[PDB]
Each structure stands twice: as structure tokens, then as C-alpha cells.
Design a protein around this ligand. Structure first.
Ligand SMILES: Nc1ncnc2c1ncn2[C@@H]1O[C@H](COP(=O)(O)CP(=O)(O)OP(=O)(O)O)[C@@H](O)[C@H]1O
Ligand SMILES: *P(=O)(O)OCC(C)(C)[C@@H](O)C(=O)NCCC(=O)NCCNC(C)=O
Ligand SMILES: CC(C)[C@H](N)C(=O)O
Length: 1186
């Protein structure tokens, strides 16, 4: 007995505890709003129970309810006070539990009533942890409420300690809610957070260690560490006497030589930063670098003095008057934050940018380099790269701090890989950095000298090399000091990783909102740590855009513009530039993904795929490959056709003896040479007549005669369009005939007779008070009347919009769609015998506006999912839930109106309206199709279709009996969901395999499902499973809203003695007749099998398999189907094509399968699918489930 005030997040939050309190005869008042000190909520209140409440109570209310305010907080206080306690308990690795406590003047600090610990498994997602913690604290309350009111609980004080978090603290981590505990802590180690020496301080130290060792070697001219230091001191004294101060730039224009090394060190010791200028650069680049730089002094000699055009003061390094007699180390004037050098990135003059690197950047890299590669003074290093390229900083600075010797590559032998190898073998060169392009050609040479070869700068593809040296792949932008990650290439990889970060460096993968990405999810690569340079010279606005302060973490980081993702082992995978993404026939492609498939060819050693644009603007791919002899164009398409769909196969192929290289040793992509070769223009009146129809169905211009219909985007839907468009020219073609003759050259043989030319449009009906319903509408109506409160046939979708979209523009667009489509203004009524349809001229759309937290969205949607009265229009409800970061549009509909294709139409028209576009009126109406089809049921064509099912469904029908629990006594619909993602690479292989063997992706997946079912049913030779078709019988219905879908049983045979490919063809043979006779209402198919809708099982099949194609619009691709805890069948498998992969959803009945069984079945499906794709000619009996 009492009166309790329940303050919680939303209406249904804490259902169990309210029901328990009410069962004890307490009166509960639920509220989520703020409580005023004087209000109706407060008067006559015994207890106040709060659970995830969103507001703080006034000091006066906490006073008037001393010892009467109980709070349910899902953490082990004092750990994780405040917001998101479960998440922070996992991320911070704190003790875990739930606490019921009193509310005091000080928040989340009142005396504990009861506390208990809780455990989270490694494989649980953060969402499961959240729900588990809530369940535990609610059960704890129910268990102890009696021992609270009666006073059996003695409160005790919280210990001082723990943690605290606020609302916005979680913003950076918003993408992590579906990641497991193990995966979250792995990410934490990779994401969560001193040098006080300059480089010349470290070099001067290295000299005192090895003063007599060789430092530099140039054509028999030698210089020891002590000689090098003294000469540098001589020039440095003079330079500082000329006014060299810290952060001052000094230009150097010299050829690789002893003087270059002496000049670089002299500028450091003097106190300034050097700006290297390669004398071999074009004149305009030299002039640009000298102008953009603030250097007033230039070190050069006579041969290059003229190239400067007298732009600054010149100091001749050959003149003895530039060297002071003093050879003593200068006194230090440099801080580690002072510039050490400035190097320019690629680009035209004015675009190219000067990158400012600081002493501490360089020291950090050199200290990591020496131990990582084990550099001892006995090592011989090569100075290969131009000294205007930061690859030379690697060559020079890392080895001078390890006592090793630098060897000045002689000009006549850098671009001759053969002589270079000879110089390295003869001289004993052990370590060197070679850019990717040059390194891949150096691998051919027989070398015995090198211990380690480091490459980088471009995508490394070849690793087969003659030699015993270790191969390393390094990555990094000039902006972050040479390299930030390193990887030891140990074996072949389709994509060679770029490795793990170096000392005091972290790599973050962020999304477009700068939010952390889970491990394995691709995003933009950001860099944090000691490698970040100062920025771009004379360019503060560009610096602020690329060197950002993160708005949540406050940390400084560099936006690289590269795409990448972490691998499970901590290594990183480069995925290309974010700009190089090009679209071809409506597919976002990374051309780099095609190359490794050309590499696998036995006769190809190097390859590079590019994107180009014709004068028209059309995109098209070209493939360059290196091989001894030219490979036929056809043999290449067939080779690539094993793993890639046609849109990723280059239109052209170019054979070359070798790739040209740039100065920096990268492949010169701009220097490669500049309707495909397999086109066979039509030469016939019929040939040309079909090449035009195919072009319109496939949406491709200038179609050829040897072009395979499926390889170029054809599917079941587009095969229907082809047939109906050939009936437009009196040419009759059947469904199965297209798959035997999938090209115009072959198909033309069967198109001679020009009869059966019946052009019949769908006819509009005269106005009537009432209209006839279709066959499927009658079935749906009768089902709904069996339980009018059931939501099992509601259809719920959501769409995430940005906060910048206007809620009211969305409402208006939906209201216009109610006006556009009579389906949204249709009602259903039972007039004695018949089920009848009425149409209203106008209908009012229910549109609800709400606000809430992201964590509450699904709970708020579930409260809105209610039955539809089929006699009332519109059969659609909608609303918008605004959170802190987005607006979630939801709409609920009934299956009698919205089917799969109807959703696609609704999404396309909604996208147009939000874009301020005008739509042409809808020409046909569903009610006219219903009258046309009801009459078609009296024709002879219908008699023949039903005759197919009478024959097939006679007698012995297989019984697929999966291992379940004891079935309930009647039909249940309680369901849950599990998901399996097939990545793009495997999805492409599946797609390529299907087309190559005259199969659709659907036929290929249906066969895998059938083998899967068979394996679970004691390798049964036959299986039965349902599927669905769009059911758009009349071609004038493809833009209407309504229910057209028809259900079909499939009797399939699996021959475990035959190969996968053989079973694939046998599934096609059984599917096509079923599609040819698909237009019989499912109720008549149940008659033909003498089965009725009764019992605890669904009549003909327990397993349903359905599949949808890729989305037609950006909006549709952002639509998510929400399951309301319903399972129409024992088990449904749905395959959706999303983001170049397959999302496979297993919807199952919870009374028949528990989570343990489903998790095993999903694991077995994946394993079976991977064996199939890789084992086409393998016998099915050799595929195993575990
Ligand atoms: N191992 C590696 N693998 C793949 N790409 C790499 C790589 N190492 C470096 N890169 C790429 O090269 C870029 C940095 O090259 P930098 O020389 O520092 C500027 P750049 O000279 O203007 O390059 P550019 O001429 O290719 O445009 C990186 O962003 C990355 O895209
Ligand atoms: P082909 O490419 O082998 O496809 C065969 C199908 C799938 C039978 C094809 O004819 C077809 O009917 N595609 C549309 C199927 C469809 O509508 N799936 C979604 C139905 N789902 C809902 C919720 O309505
Ligand atoms: C090693 C260095 C040259 C770096 N990888 C770059 O490409 O700029």
C-alpha cells in the first residue's frame, strides 16, 4: 500500500519494476518531465523511485523526501558516477556492478542501500552489457524492495573514490556500441594516450664515441666523424657570424658530395634550418623554392651559382674564405622546437607547399630507427634519394647517429640498377632506403651485401627477390617526418600491410565526423605524436585545416587524406587515397583493388591500373602490366572474370617492358601511354534492333553482339523487362531461353517469327463506391482478422538525417505522397461474402515529434508500433525522433500496402521531394490491376500454371525438419535476429562466379542455402523452402504502391555425389519453371497440395529465403528495416546487397531455437559458403559444417 512516483527515461522504461510495485497494490505515477516544487506530481507521494532520470531535483524536494528518494544506478558506485556508466566501466576497466542508493544533496553520492557485482563476457557487445546491467538492477530492486520499505536495510556511506563522467564525454565513441568487449579494449590500446635534445647535440655525442670511424665515402674521398665535425664547425662559425639565428632558413644547392654533408651539419650547428634545392630540378621550381623560402643565404658552388639568378647572398663552399680557423663545437643556442629543415611536397609552382620539420621530430625518428634495425657502426649506408626529398633525411641522419658510413651514390650509377648492384656487392652495402618503384626493379638483381632494404612511398606489390635481405614496407607523409609506421614483409599478401606505428606515435581511424572507428572498419587515417611538423610555410589557413585540434579530445592531429583500417593483429592496411575513388556504371571503385588480381597471373610481374576520362566525361579504366610477351585481351578478361564483376574489368590493357619512374623513384603514372576490343557492332536489322533494346534495359550505350547479358548487370528483373520489350516488337522470348543464349549473337537465332504482338495497356476503372480486392489482399485481410491486435504484418523502417534537415519539410513530403498514391488512401471492408476496397479523396497522416537520447531510440520506436485498423486510412504512420547528433525519421505501415518494391518507390519519391523536384502524376492504380488479374484467373494461361503445381505438389513432398526444441501447441511469432556480413571481396567473387556460369546471384545463393539445409537434415537428397517474387505481373505496375508479392514453394534436389557447379545448374533447372508459373495465388497452391493453414506448423515449408537487389537511391540505402520481435516462420534468411557486400539476416522463432543453436547455425553457414566459393569443382559431400 502506498503511492509511488516513478521518474525515468521514457514511458516503458522499467516495465518489470512498475508491474511488481503495482502487483503489491502500490499506485505508480510515471513521469519523465521535470518536477516543480509545487505540482500535482508531488502532492500525496510516499516514495520517489528514479531510474535513468534525466533531471536533477530541487533542494527543497530532496529535503521534503529525506530517506524517501531511491535511485537505480547501473554501476558499482563510486565508480562511474554520472552518464553512460556501463560504457565507461568497460572502457576504463573499473569494477562492474549495479547500485541502489539514496538521493542526497550531493548527486550520485547518497548512502548505499544494496550493491552487487556483475560480469561482462568478452564476446558481449556494449549493447548487451547495457541491457544485462539494466536487467540485473531491476531484478535487484524487485528482490530487495520489501527489505527497504520495512526498514530491514541499514544504509551505509559510499567510499570516496571512483570516477565521474558527463553527457558529452562519450561523443568521440559513438560508433562503438555494437563492438565486443574484447574488440573495444583492443581499440583502446591503439588510441588512448620526452625529447630535449637537438640533432647536432646527438651527432657531436656520436663523434666522441667513434671519432676515427668513416662517416662519408665518395669515389675514394673519405671523411671520418671527427673530420666531418671539424669542417662543419669551421663553416658554422662563419655562418653564425653572418647572422644565422634560430628558425632562420638557409638554402643549399649542391650535388651529392662531401660538401653537401658538411653544409647540412654547418647550418644546424650555426643554429638555422636548411632548405635543400636539387640543382637538377627545372629552373622554375628552383626559382619558386627560393622565392617562397625566407632564406637570405644560399650555400652553393660555381657550377650552380647561375641557377639562383642572384636572388640571395651566396656563400661559396669551395672558397676557403667561407671557413673559419676555429674547429671547436659551437655553443648551443637551439631548442628542440626549432626548425631543422624545410622540404616541399609534389605539385606545380605556387601549389607545392613547404613543410616545416622540427628538431624533436627528427630526433624521435632517428632514435627509433637505430635499435629497430640494429644499426651498428659496422654498417654501410647508401645515400640514394635526392636531398630535396625526405627519403634522403632517412639516408643521412639515421646512420650518422649509429656510427655507420654513408656512401655518396656516384651519378653514373644511380639510374643503372645493374651497376648499382655491383657497387653494393663490391663495397659491402648492408642497409638502404629505396623508393617503391626503384626497389621492385632492384629485386631482380643478385645481391649478397644487403641485410635490410626499406621501401615505401607507394603501394608495394612485388616481394619475390634475388637475395637474402629483409624487406620492409614503410609509410608516412612528409608532413609527419619521413615515416610513422613500419612493417616487415614476411610472406605474400594480396594487400601488404604498412605495419605498426613508431615511437611516441598513435594512428587513429576516424569517420567523416571525426569519430573513432572500430577495429576492422575503414576510415581516414589521422596521425598523433612527436612526428607532426610545425606546418606549411607561409600558409596558416591550410595548416589549420590539416593540423587540427580535435573538437572532443583536444589533441593535435594531422589529417592525411589516406584511407586505411586496422587489422586484428594491430598492423595497418592502406586502402588508397580518399580522392582516387571513381564511379563506373554506378559503383564506387578503388582502381587499386584490381591490381593484385593481375599480379597473380603467372606471366605478369608488375601492374598499375589507372582511371581516365574521355572528352565526353565518361569514366573508364585502363590496365598496364609488365610481362615478357603480350597477353591476349581475351585471356585477361577471362582471368579477371574469375573474381571481379564486369564493371571492375579494365576496358583496355597495355603491355610494356617496364614502368617509367619519377625522380623520387615512384611509378610515373602520368608518363604511361594513352567501345572496347571485344565490341562486335551489329550487322543485321535484327541484330541492331536487339542491341537497342538491350541498351535500354541494361542502361548502357552502344551494346555489342558478344556482350553477355548477366555479366553486364542483367538479373531476373531485367530479364523480365527484356521479354516485355521484345513483345513490343512481336518477338516472343521465354524466360529460360535467355539463360541458354545470353548474348545477342546467340539469342538472334530464336527470334524469326514476328507474331504474338499483343500490346495491352492496363485500363482505368470507372468511379465506383466500392472496388474488388486482389487475391493477395484478400489473404492478408483474412489473416489480420484472425488477430486484429497482431503487429506481425507491420513494416517499420528508419532513416537517419542530419540535424540541418527541416522536420516540417519531411512531414509535408510524406503528406504529398499520401495524396499521390491511392494505396495510402485505401480502406478494406467485408461486404457479406466479398472483401471490398473503398478509396477516400483525402486522408490525415499521423506525424509525431519526439526528442530523446540515442540509447532510447529503439525503445521509443517500439512504443509507436501498434496495430492498423484496415478499415481506416492512411495505412501509414510516421514521426521524427531528434537526438543530440541526428534526426531519426521512422514510418510504420502494413504489409497489405507496402511491399519491397513499394518501399523503393516511396524512398525514391521522398528523395525527389526533399530535393525540391516536381513529380509527374501516377498513371495507373492498384485497383485496376486487381480487376485485370481477377479476370486473368479465368483464362487458359492460368489453367496451365495451376496445372504445373498440381503435378509438382502431388504425393511425396519432402519434409525439412531442422533440429529444434519442443514446438509449442499453436503457432507462435516471437522472434529474434542474428546477422552475418559477407565482405566486398567475397561478394565480388560470388557475383563473378554466378555470371561466368549463366547464373544469377540469387540462383547461386539459393543453392548454398539448399546445401546448408540438406546438411542439417541428414544430407537429404531433396529439400523444400519458400521464397518470394515481386509479383508485378502487368508491366504497367512497376511504379504503384501496393502488395504484389507472391509466395512460392521450391522443391530442390541436392546431389551430394556431384560438384557444386553441377548442383548449381540443377537448381536453375528447377527454379525457372517455378518462375514461369509464379502467378498462381499461394492459396491455390495450397489446394494443389491438399494442405490447409492449421496446426503449429506453416503448411508447406518451415524455412523462407528471400533476397533484394542493391538500393536504387542514396535515401533507400540509408533506410534500415526494424524487426519488432516477430518471426513469420520458423526461420527466415534474407540477403541484402549493401555497400558492395551482403548482409545476411537470420530471423528465427525463439520458442524453437535458443541463442546457442542459432550462433552455431550461422557459423556453419559462413563456413559452408567459404568452401563453396573456393571449391566450385568440388563434390558437395566434401563440404563440412564444422
Ligand atoms: N608504403 C606506402 N604504401 C602506400 N602508400 C604510401 C606509402 N608510403 C607513402 N604512401 C603514400 O604517399 C603519400 C605521401 O607521400 P609524400 O612524398 O610525403 C607527399 P607527395 O610527394 O606529394 O606524394 P605524391 O607525389 O604521390 O602526391 C602518403 O600519403 C601515401 O598516400
Ligand atoms: P533472379 O535475379 O535469380 O531473382 C529471382 C527472384 C528474386 C525471384 C526475382 O524474380 C524477384 O522476384 N526479385 C524480387 C524479389 C523481392 O521482391 N524480394 C523482396 C520481397 N520482400 C518484401 C518485404 O516485400
Ligand atoms: C620515406 C619517405 C620518402 C615517405 N614514405 C614519403 O613518401 O614521403
Amino acid at each position: 500500500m502506498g503511492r509511488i512516483l516513478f521518474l525515468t527515461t521514457f514511458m516503458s522504461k522499467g516495465n518489470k519494476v512498475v508491474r511488481y510495485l503495482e502487483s503489491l497494490h502500490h499506485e505508480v505515477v510515471i513521469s519523465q518531465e521535470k518536477v516543480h516544487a509545487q505540482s500535482a506530481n508531488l502532492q500525496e507521494i510516499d516514495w520517489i523511485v528514479s531510474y535513468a532520470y534525466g533531471y536533477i531535483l530541487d533542494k527543497e524536494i530532496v529535503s521534503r523526501f529525506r530517506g524517501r528518494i531511491i535511485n537505480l544506478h547501473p554501476s558499482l558506485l563510486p565508480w562511474n558516477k554520472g552518464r553512460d556508466p556501463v560504457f565507461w566501466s568497460v572502457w576504463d576497466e573499473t569494477p562492474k556492478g549495479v547500485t541502489i542508493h539514496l538521493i542526497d544533496e550531493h548527486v550520485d553520492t547518497g548512502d548505499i542501500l544494496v550493491q552487487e557485482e556483475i560480469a561482462f563476457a568478452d564476446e558481449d557487445t556494449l549493447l548487451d552489457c547495457y541491457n544485462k546491467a539494466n536487467q540485473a538492477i531491476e531484478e535487484l530492486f524487485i528482490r530487495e524492495w520489501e527489505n527497504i520499505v520495512h526498514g530491514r536495510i541499514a544504509p551505509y556511506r559510499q567510499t570516496a573514490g571512483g570516477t565521474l563522467h558527463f553527457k558529452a564525454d562519450r561523443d568521440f565513441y559513438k560508433n562503438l556500441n555494437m563492438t565486443t568487449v574484447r574488440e573495444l579494449l583492443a581499440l583502446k590500446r591503439l588510441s588512448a594516450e620526452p625529447i630535449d635534445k637537438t640533432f647536432h647535440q646527438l651527432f657531436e655525442q656520436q663523434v666522441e664515441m667513434t671519432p676515427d670511424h668513416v662517416a662519408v665515402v665518395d669515389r675514394g674521398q673519405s671523411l671520418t666523424y671527427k673530420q666531418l665535425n671539424e669542417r662543419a664547425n669551421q663553416l658554422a662559425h662563419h655562418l653564425r657570424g653572418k647572422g644565422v639565428k634560430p628558425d632562420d632558413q638557409v638554402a643549399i644547392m649542391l650535388d651529392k658530395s662531401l660538401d653537401m654533408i658538411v653544409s647540412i651539419l654547418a647550418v644546424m650547428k650555426a643554429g638555422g634550418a636548411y632548405v635543400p634545392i636539387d640543382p637538377d630540378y627545372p629552373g622554375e621550381r628552383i626559382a619558386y623554392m627560393l622565392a617562397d623560402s625566407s632564406a637570405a643565404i644560399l650555400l652553393t658552388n660555381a657550377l650552380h651559382e647561375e641557377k639562383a639568378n642572384g636572388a640571395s647572398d651566396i656563400i661559396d663552399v669551395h672558397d676557403p674564405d667561407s671557413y673559419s680557423e676555429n674547429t671547436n663545437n659551437l655553443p648551443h643556442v637551439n631548442r628542440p622546437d626549432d626548425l631543422v629543415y624545410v622540404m616541399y611536397t609534389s605539385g606545380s609552382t605556387g601549389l607545392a607547399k613547404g613543410v616545416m620539420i622540427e628538431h624533436h621530430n627528427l630526433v624521435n625518428f632517428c632514435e627509433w630507427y637505430r635499435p629497430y634495425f640494429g644499426v651498428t657502426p659496422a654498417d654501410k649506408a647508401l645515400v640514394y634519394s635526392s636531398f630535396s626529398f625526405d627519403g634522403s633525411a632517412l639516408d643521412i641522419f639515421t646512420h650518422l647517429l649509429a656510427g655507420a658510413a654513408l656512401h655518396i651514390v656516384p651519378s653514373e650509377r644511380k639510374y643503372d640498377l645493374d651497376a648499382l648492384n655491383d657497387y653494393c656487392n663490391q663495397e659491402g652495402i648492408t642497409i638502404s632506403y629505396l623508393p617503391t618503384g626503384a626497389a621492385e626493379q632492384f629485386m631482380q638483381m643478385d645481391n649478397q651485401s644487403f641485410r635490410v632494404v626499406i621501401t615505401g612511398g607507394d603501394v608495394l606489390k612485388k616481394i619475390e627477390r634475388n637475395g637474402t635481405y629483409k624487406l620492409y614496407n614503410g609509410y608516412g607523409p612528409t608532413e609527419c617526418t619521413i615515416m610513422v609506421t613500419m612493417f616487415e614483409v614476411d610472406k605474400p599478401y594480396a594487400n601488404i600491410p604498412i605495419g605498426k606505428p613508431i615511437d611516441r606515435t598513435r594512428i587513429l581511424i576516424l569517420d567523416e565526423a571525426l569519430a573513432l572507428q572500430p577495429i576492422g572498419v575503414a576510415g581516414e587515417l589521422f596521425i598523433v605524436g612527436e612526428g607532426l611538423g610545425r606546418g606549411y610555410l607561409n600558409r596558416p589557413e591550410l595548416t589549420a585545416e590539416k593540423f587540427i585540434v580535435h573538437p572532443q579530445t583536444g589533441e593535435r592531429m594531422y589529417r592525411t587524406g589516406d584511407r586505411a583500417r586496422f587489422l586484428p593483429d594491430g598492423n595497418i592496411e592502406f586502402l588508397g587515397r580518399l580522392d582516387n575513388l571513381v564511379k563506373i556504371r554506378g559503383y564506387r571503385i578503388e582502381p587499386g583493388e584490381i591490381e593484385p588480381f593481375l599480379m597473380n597471373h603467372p606471366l605478369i610481374e608488375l601492374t598499375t591500373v589507372l582511371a581516365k576520362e574521355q572528352a565526353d566525361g565518361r569514366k573508364y579504366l585502363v590496365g598496364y602490366y609488365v610481362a615478357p610477351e603480350e597477353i591476349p585481351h581475351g585471356e585477361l578478361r577471362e582471368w579477371l572474370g574469375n573474381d571481379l564483376p564486369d564493371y571492375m574489368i579494365p576496358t583496355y590493357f597495355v603491355h610494356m617492358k617496364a614502368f617509367p619512374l619519377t625522380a623520387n623513384g615512384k611509378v610515373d603514372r602520368r608518363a604511361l601511354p594513352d567501345l572496347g576490343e571485344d565490341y562486335v557492332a551489329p550487322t543485321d536489322e535484327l541484330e541492331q534492333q536487339l542491341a537497342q533494346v538491350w541498351s535500354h534495359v541494361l542502361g548502357i550505350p552502344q551494346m555489342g553482339i558478344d556482350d553477355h547479358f548477366l555479366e553486364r548487370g542483367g538479373d531476373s528483373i531485367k530479364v523480365m523487362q527484356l521479354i516485355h520489350q521484345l513483345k513490343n516488337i512481336g518477338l516472343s522470348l521465354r524466360y529460360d531461353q535467355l539463360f541458354t543464349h545470353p548474348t545477342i549473337r546467340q539469342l538472334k537465332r530464336l527470334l524469326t517469327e514476328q507474331k504474338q504482338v499483343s500490346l495491352e495497356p492496363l485500363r482505368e476503372l470507372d468511379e465506383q463506391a466500392e472496388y474488388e480486392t486482389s487475391a493477395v489482399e484478400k489473404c492478408m485481410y483474412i489473416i489480420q482478422q484472425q488477430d486484429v491486435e497482431s503487429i506481425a504484418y507491420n513494416v517499420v523502417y528508419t532513416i537517419n538525417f542530419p540535424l540541418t534537415v527541416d522536420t516540417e519539410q519531411i512531414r509535408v513530403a510524406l503528406e504529398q505522397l499520401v495524396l499521390r498514391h491511392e494505396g495510402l488512401r485505401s480502406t478494406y471492408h467485408m461486404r457479406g461474402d466479398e472483401i471490398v476496397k473503398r478509396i477516400v479523396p483525402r486522408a490525415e497522416l499521423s506525424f509525431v515529434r519526439q526528442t530523446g537520447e540515442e540509447e532510447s531510440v529503439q525503445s521509443l520506436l517500439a512504443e509507436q508500433i501498434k496495430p492498423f485498423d484496415l478499415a481506416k486510412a492512411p495505412l501509414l504512420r510516421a514521426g521524427v525522433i531528434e537526438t543530440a547528433d541526428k534526426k531519426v525519421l521512422w514510418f510504420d505501415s502494413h504489409h497489405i500496402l507496402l511491399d519491397g518494391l513499394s518501399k523503393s518507390i516511396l524512398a525514391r519519391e521522398l528523395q525527389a521531394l526533399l530535393g525540391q523536384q516536381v513529380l509527374s502524376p501516377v498513371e495507373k492504380t492498384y485497383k485496376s490491376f486487381a480487376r485485370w488479374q481477377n479476370e486473368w484467373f479465368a483464362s487458359d494461361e492460368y489453367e496451365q500454371q495451376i496445372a504445373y503445381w498440381k503435378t509438382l505438389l502431388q504425393g511425396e513432398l519432402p519434409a525439412v525438419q531442422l533440429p529444434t526444441k519442443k514446438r509449442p501447441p499453436q503457432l507462435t511469432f516471437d522472434g529474434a535476429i542474428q546477422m552475418y556480413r559477407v565482405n566486398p571481396e567475397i561478394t565480388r567473387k560470388l557475383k563473378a562466379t554466378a555470371a561466368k556460369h549463366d547464373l544469377t546471384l540469387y540462383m547461386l545463393m539459393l543453392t548454398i542455402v539448399s546445401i546448408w539445409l540438406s546438411k542439417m537434415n541428414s544430407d537429404s537428397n531433396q529439400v523444400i523452402l519458400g521464397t518470394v517474387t515481386d509479383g508485378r505481373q502487368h508491366p504497367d505496375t512497376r511504379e504503384l504502391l501496393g502488395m504484389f508479392v507472391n509466395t512460392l514453394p521450391l522443391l530442390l534436389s541436392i546431389d551430394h555425389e556431384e560438384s557444386f557447379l553441377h548442383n548449381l545448374q540443377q537448381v536453375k533447372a528447377k527454379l525457372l519453371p517455378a518462375l514461369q508459373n509464379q502467378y498462381v495465388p499461394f492459396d491455390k497452391i495450397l489446394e494443389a497440395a491438399r494442405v490447409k493453414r492449421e496446426g503449429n506448423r506453416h503448411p508447406l515449408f518451415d524455412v523462407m529465403f528471400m533476397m533484394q537487389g542493391a538500393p536504387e537511391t542514396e535515401l533507400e540505402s540509408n533506410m534500415h528495416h526494424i524487426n519488432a520481435g516477430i518471426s513469420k516462420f520458423d526461420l527466415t534468411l534474407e540477403v541484402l546487397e549493401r555497400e558492395n557486400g551482403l548482409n545476411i539476416v537470420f530471423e528465427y522463432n525463439t520458442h524453437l531455437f535458443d541463442e546457442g543453436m542459432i550462433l552455431r547455425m550461422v557459423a556453419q553457414f559462413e563456413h559452408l559458403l567459404l568452401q563453396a566459393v573456393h571449391g566450385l569443382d568440388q563434390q558437395v559431400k566434401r563440404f563440412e559444417l564444422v
